[PDB]
Amino acid sequence: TLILTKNQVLHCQFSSWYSLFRKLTPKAKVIKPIPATVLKYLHEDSIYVYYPEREAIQLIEKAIKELGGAVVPKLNWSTPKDALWITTTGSLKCTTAEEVLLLLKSSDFVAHDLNHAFDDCKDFDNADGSVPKDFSFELVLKEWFPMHASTEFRCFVKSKRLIAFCQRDDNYYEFLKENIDCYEKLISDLLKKLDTFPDPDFVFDVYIHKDRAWLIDINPFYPRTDGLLFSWSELESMNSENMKPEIRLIPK
């Protein structure tokens, strides 16, 4: 049975692991702490179609420029993958500060980051709405790029070993199953490089494209992290001393 600690949630902050793994992951910029004025804008629960003062706006705009003009935004933990419905494009791709703020303001995941991030934590009581010391919310802009959704994987690590991984998306893809051994090797090679991550149990998402593995995200080993094709019952009970990871792909 699994517990979530305050430090586990802190370790999965984008700013925490991006410094560790900068060379393994798509380029990004981090604005930390988040401008109090952006933070105020984001807490607005209005459903209809106040604003961050342009000091803050220009800061965001600079980041987009440095990253090539097209980005995917997130706060400390969650990508606003749920807010695809605020976009005309049906994309996370943002090219202006306005696109960024709209997408983030419209997301439940982002909302979850702001009000519920330390909710499940054993060793930290936030019922009074408080947060750990030296913690700050941050705004992350990652370089955008066209990703083949079906060659992204979610990868489960227990006691520093790869126990399982599955296809991250939910649409069948012929190609994966004829090449699965190639994918396992690249994934298990990348984990080797993650040996600086501080906790022995964690979940990492990986994008694999033309025989190259990219670290995309890191999340706690805890059922708040979506198990996708695996359940947390089986993940908890999997023996970590095994040789072959379990692998699951989407059915035809």
Curated annotation (Swiss-Prot):
GO terms for cellular component: cytoplasm; cytosol. Belongs to the CDC123 family. Mg(2+) binds at residues 217, 219. This is Translation initiation factor eIF2 assembly protein. It is found in: Cytoplasm. GO terms for molecular function: ATP binding; magnesium ion binding; protein folding chaperone. It comes from Schizosaccharomyces pombe (strain 972 / ATCC 24843). Keywords: ATP-binding, Chaperone, Cytoplasm, Magnesium, Metal-binding, Nucleotide-binding. ATP-dependent protein-folding chaperone for the eIF2 complex. Binds to the gamma subunit of the eIF2 complex which allows the subunit to assemble with the alpha and beta subunits. Interacts with the eIF2 complex gamma subunit tif213; the interaction is direct. GO terms for biological process: eukaryotic translation initiation factor 2 complex assembly. Disruption phenotype: Inviable. ATP binds at residues 74, 77, 79, 81, 142-145, 152, 154, 168, 205, 217, 219. The gene is cdc123. InterPro entries: CDC123.
